[PDB]
Design a protein around this ligand. Sequence first.
Ligand code: CLA
Ligand code: CLA
Ligand code: CLA
Ligand code: CLA
Ligand SMILES: CCCCCCCCCCCCCCCC(=O)O[C@H](COC(=O)CCCCCCCCCCCC)CO[C@@H]1O[C@@H](CO)[C@H](O)[C@H](O)[C@@H]1O
Ligand code: HEM
Ligand SMILES: CC1=C(\C=C/C(C)=C/C=C/C(C)=C/C=C/C=C(C)/C=C/C=C(C)/C=C/C2=C(C)CCCC2(C)C)C(C)(C)CCC1
Ligand SMILES: CC1=C(\C=C/C(C)=C/C=C\C(C)=C\C=C\C=C(C)\C=C\C=C(C)\C=C\C2=C(C)CCCC2(C)C)C(C)(C)CCC1
Ligand SMILES: CC1=C(\C=C/C(C)=C/C=C\C(C)=C\C=C\C=C(C)\C=C\C=C(C)\C=C\C2=C(C)CCCC2(C)C)C(C)(C)CCC1
Lengths: 36, 36, 30, 49, 137, 98, 242, 37, 49, 49, 95
Amino acid sequence: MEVNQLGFIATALFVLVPSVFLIILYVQTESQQKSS
Amino acid sequence: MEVNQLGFIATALFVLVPSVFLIILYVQTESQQKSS
Amino acid sequence: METITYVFIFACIIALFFFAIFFREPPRIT
Amino acid sequence: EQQGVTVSFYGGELNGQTFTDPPTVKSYARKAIFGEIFEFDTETLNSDG
Amino acid sequence: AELTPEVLTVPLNSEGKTITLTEKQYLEGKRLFQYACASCHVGGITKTNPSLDLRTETLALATPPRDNIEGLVDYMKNPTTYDGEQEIAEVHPSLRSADIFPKMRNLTEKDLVAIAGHILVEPKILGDKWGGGKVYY
Amino acid sequence: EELVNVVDEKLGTAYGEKIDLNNTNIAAFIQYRGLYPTLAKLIVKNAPYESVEDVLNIPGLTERQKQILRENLEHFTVTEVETALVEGGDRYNNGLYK
Amino acid sequence: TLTYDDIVGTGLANKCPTLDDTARGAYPIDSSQTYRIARLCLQPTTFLVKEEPKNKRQEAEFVPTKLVTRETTSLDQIQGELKVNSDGSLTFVEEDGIDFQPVTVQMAGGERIPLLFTVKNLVASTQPNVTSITTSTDFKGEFNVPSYRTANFLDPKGRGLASGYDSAIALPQAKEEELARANVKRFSLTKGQISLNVAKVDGRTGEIAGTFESEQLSDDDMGAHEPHEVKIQGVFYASIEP
Amino acid sequence: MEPNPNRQPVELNRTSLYLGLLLILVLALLFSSYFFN
Amino acid sequence: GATLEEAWSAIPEKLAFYDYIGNNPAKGGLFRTGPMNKGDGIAQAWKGH
Amino acid sequence: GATLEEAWSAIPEKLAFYDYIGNNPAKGGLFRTGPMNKGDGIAQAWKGH
Amino acid sequence: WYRVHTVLINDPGRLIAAHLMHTALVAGWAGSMALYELATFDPSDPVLNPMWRQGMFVLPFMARLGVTGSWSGWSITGETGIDPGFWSFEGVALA
Ligand code: CLA
Ligand code: CLA
Ligand code: CLA
Ligand code: CLA
Ligand SMILES: CCCCCCCCCCCCCCCC(=O)O[C@H](COC(=O)CCCCCCCCCCCC)CO[C@@H]1O[C@@H](CO)[C@H](O)[C@H](O)[C@@H]1O
Ligand code: HEM
Ligand SMILES: CC1=C(\C=C/C(C)=C/C=C/C(C)=C/C=C/C=C(C)/C=C/C=C(C)/C=C/C2=C(C)CCCC2(C)C)C(C)(C)CCC1
Ligand SMILES: CC1=C(\C=C/C(C)=C/C=C\C(C)=C\C=C\C=C(C)\C=C\C=C(C)\C=C\C2=C(C)CCCC2(C)C)C(C)(C)CCC1
Ligand SMILES: CC1=C(\C=C/C(C)=C/C=C\C(C)=C\C=C\C=C(C)\C=C\C=C(C)\C=C\C2=C(C)CCCC2(C)C)C(C)(C)CCC1
């Protein structure tokens, strides 16, 4: 159809920026005990 | 111009998937000593 | 696209499910 | 039509003219609902309407 | 002092002579109506055939003109289509109505004289929500 | 080089001001008296009329209906039969009620 | 000998009668007596759509489609005087009868082809000179193809003909000078052809059974997309009578 | 199911990225335009 | 001293254009992602009342 | 027994199409992002030698 | 990271799961590509618009070894009245 060439870019980001935020603070946590 | 409506997503991501990867392995690192 | 996105955001709700039903950090009775 | 309508433009760009053929007159009335009708270049920035 | 008798004052026959109604005899046209016609023509419109309505004009044009008590009475006695012929009592219940859909058996003159009033009385009440169904209301 | 709404263009003519003994849907004959129930059924069950008068001819009429047809003649009219206007038995039940 | 029940839900109530195998003697006509055929019937076997090849000089082809509309594709109970002209040939006309049958098919790709299998108006014409409907007699004649949809059919957004929205309303100020194709929705009318061949009749009765063909066009879909030609065949049956 | 020993800690220093974050982010600038075409 | 025609001629573009709805904030939508021009189009001129 | 005009008519599309350069992978480029069709257009029919 | 995947050089335990996975991301990418390739390969013509025209990278490999029929009802041949069973670019992918 006739979608907003960037609607996808916004969804993709908005699902990484916020999401990654957690795959960041989480990981640093398990390493609170010299682990991956 | 008449670029590739998806040169963006392509770019932007390639500078986030990898990049964020480091911000991840790195971040857990300073937590190797109960820190941010 | 538009559909490719829809099937993706979805297939991760499926991963996110698998992950919290088997990668549940056991609840400790202390 | 059955009541056979007709528009005439006074002032503006289309000024001086009088359209009779139903299609047209039907046309302008519908663009009149929007008030005063103007000419929009939709092409340039690919308007959608 | 809202439904004055000059409004209950309806044309009973063709000739042009008039017979007036009471606040009383009206209710019955109605009470009757609903017992008797409700099924269809509710609000003044035949559901079996939307094409035909109980509007004052309609009746007036009909044949024989049914915009008069005697007329709606004629009908309630002998049922015929718009325009002259084809006695339709073998379908449309009427005092004829060979004992069919008994809703008719009982009634009397006191009754038919009134129901028929109710029909011509209404539009005088309900602007024309009387002939128009669904769209109005 | 342009296409146009077939039906509502006929609305700039007769049909759409009087009665088209060749198109108009049946129940439009309830507009005057002595015409509905029968003559109408007849007015339509008979092929279109190349001239409003041809009504009067119709095999079967009684001098009386033949009468009515004449005094109500001043109201009827005719223009090309229109395929989109009466194909699906729309002549009779034009799909639309009260 | 069989009842509405016997067939109810079966899947044959849509199949024309089988003129008992073994009975090729013909039915004789008069011209002294006028005939008619109680019921004409056209049950189909398979539909065929002409492929619209991009290339030109490599002749259009007729591919087979698959009956998607659940079995509801038959015309049984039609009629219209079977007159004998001052020739020798017979010209069955028509009047009442279930001639229309909206039915769709799914082309080889993903395409959906819908059509209204019909014989409305029909005009049969036997071989120039026959005295009795002998096996292998024929009728090939025309008939009209209305439009898959009357004047009242209203498409997705408002629009239509007899009474639909005027013009694409979802878009207020966009230019309609292109949408037009579907803004105004005109109703089409073309003629298609049929042709019947017999290969079975019971002279005593008049039950002439056989096959048929006919080429009608798909759906014009109002001012939409130029139609598709459809070839349709099957087995049929008509029963003559005084 | 006793824990796993071959699970050493995951190594990465604060300028290790300062080497990579550059390389990738700059690598981006170049190879970008060829994406926009 | 002016004709029905010379009359509207007087009312200038700017004023007419405001009497257009496509310039009523009120007609938008939560997801009409863009400058008015994308919607109705780049207002090119007045066709005349 | 055939004419210069009848001769090539024999040679079928498929075959003529192949002798086209645009169907020669040799002509691409590292950043020609997609199916050959985007490049020279969706091949419709042969124009004739 | 540069050594982060050395945690398996020994115990073929969590080592097979690695291979067991890469190899599910591979066939995971298999059919998924096909649905994609599949979901855009206009079959309508094989003479001026063959799979190899409209860039098709996985499709071509199926045909070669057999699967040429599709549950859509066509075939990379031209023919229209056949259809292998579950082994149509559909199942192959689905598979
Ligand atoms: C076949 C593909 C594959 C397989 C079988 C493995 C298998 C393994 N990886 Mg691994 N990895 C991969 C691809 C793969 N990787 C890729 C493409 C990257 C980019 C970095 C990594 C980065 C990586 C790191 C830093 C580490 C591993 C580790 C490991 C071991 C633990 C698993 C874990 O890390 O989850 C994979 C974790 C990731 C973050 C990669 C998957 C997720 C991202 C990176 C890929 C795409 C985005 C991501 C998937 C979004 C959510 C991912 C989610 C699974 C966390 C295990 C042997 C080690 C381990 O887990 O503990 C030491 C470890 O430290 N991997
Ligand atoms: C014979 C076929 C084959 C072989 C030998 C391999 C081998 C490998 N794969 Mg693999 N893979 C294959 C087919 C194969 N794959 C197929 C068919 C798929 C799906 C279609 C995958 C999907 C896959 C994933 C998701 C991952 C692997 C990974 C790996 C590596 C695991 C260990 C590692 O550290 O790699 C060493 C790493 C390399 C040799 C990478 C070199 C490749 C260069 C050219 C990178 C290209 C840059 C590209 C991404 C541009 C965008 C940049 C952006 C990613 C930031 C290993 C080299 C893992 C990996 O590589 O770790 C990060 C991993 O996460 N594979
Ligand atoms: C002697 C018979 C035998 C057979 C037939 C196999 C077959 C296989 N081995 Mg294997 N292996 C064997 C002996 C065998 N092994 C021995 C003696 C050792 C010890 C040294 C190993 C150590 C080993 C490792 C570490 C790994 C394998 C892997 C594999 C698989 C490779 C991937 C593949 O097959 O493609 C895809 C598979 C198919 C197309 C068919 C799959 C059929 C499955 C397995 C059904 C049966 C599995 C399940 C129900 C239980 C049986 C498991 C087991 C019997 C194989 C393959 C199924 C893996 C591999 O290399 O690739 C992932 C792998 O990582 N093997
Ligand atoms: C179980 C057996 C099996 C079978 C019958 C298939 C069949 C298929 N796969 Mg497949 N696949 C399998 C297992 C299988 N796969 C496994 C276990 C994985 C990992 C998860 C995959 C991952 C995968 C992907 C990503 C894709 C396929 C695809 C396909 C299809 C096209 C690929 C092809 O033509 O093969 C080509 C294979 C070869 C030509 C074999 C080459 C291997 C080398 C040359 C042999 C090396 C031998 C070695 C040196 C030992 C010495 C030999 C000795 C005798 C001397 C085809 C239907 C493609 C597809 O679905 O398209 C429709 C596709 O994209 N597969
Ligand atoms: C600006 C234009 C000029 C040209 C470009 C300039 C940039 C040049 C920088 C490159 C220097 C040499 C090569 C770099 C290697 C290096 O740097 O190595 C690592 C750096 O980080 C790294 O990058 C580690 C590699 C991680 C790259 C992550 C991006 C890849 C995308 C992942 C996608 C996942 C799906 C760190 O080294 C390590 O250093 C210690 C660990 O911190 C160890 O003890 C070892 O010495 C080890 O070598
Ligand atoms: C009991 C009170 C009723 C009254 C006073 C009444 C009155 C009328 C009148 C006056 C007409 C024709 C008027 C015109 O055409 O202008 C008519 C028609 C009709 N009525 Fe009633 N009616 C009554 C009840 C019913 C009921 C209960 C039915 C249920 C079947 C019914 C069915 C019909 C039908 C089908 C017509 C169409 C006439 C035709 O055949 O053309 N009526 N009625
Ligand atoms: C498509 C695509 C692609 C690729 C890729 C992608 C897209 C992605 C992804 C993906 C994903 C993202 C995926 C997935 C996944 C998921 C999974 C694989 C899963 C799972 C899950 C599970 C397994 C589960 C769990 C469970 C539950 C839910 C509950 C209980 C039961 C069970 C256990 C089952 C391609 C290249 C072709 C193209 C582009 C796009
Ligand atoms: C996305 C996108 C877009 C665009 C964009 C944007 C606009 C973005 C943004 C962005 C942003 C919005 C970003 C941000 C950020 C951030 C920040 C800002 C941060 C931070 C932080 C900080 C801050 C840190 C640190 C520090 C230090 C070192 C100490 C003190 C100082 C400081 C705090 C700085 C759009 C929608 C159009 C489309 C889609 C996509
Ligand atoms: C981007 C983009 C695109 C598309 C796409 C794609 C195709 C993507 C992809 C993607 C991908 C390619 C992704 C990936 C990934 C990943 C992975 C795959 C990972 C991982 C990992 C892992 C694996 C983990 C874990 C685990 C566990 C839990 C244990 C064992 C098993 C395993 C290992 C799984 C394009 C170019 C078109 C455009 C631009 C944008």
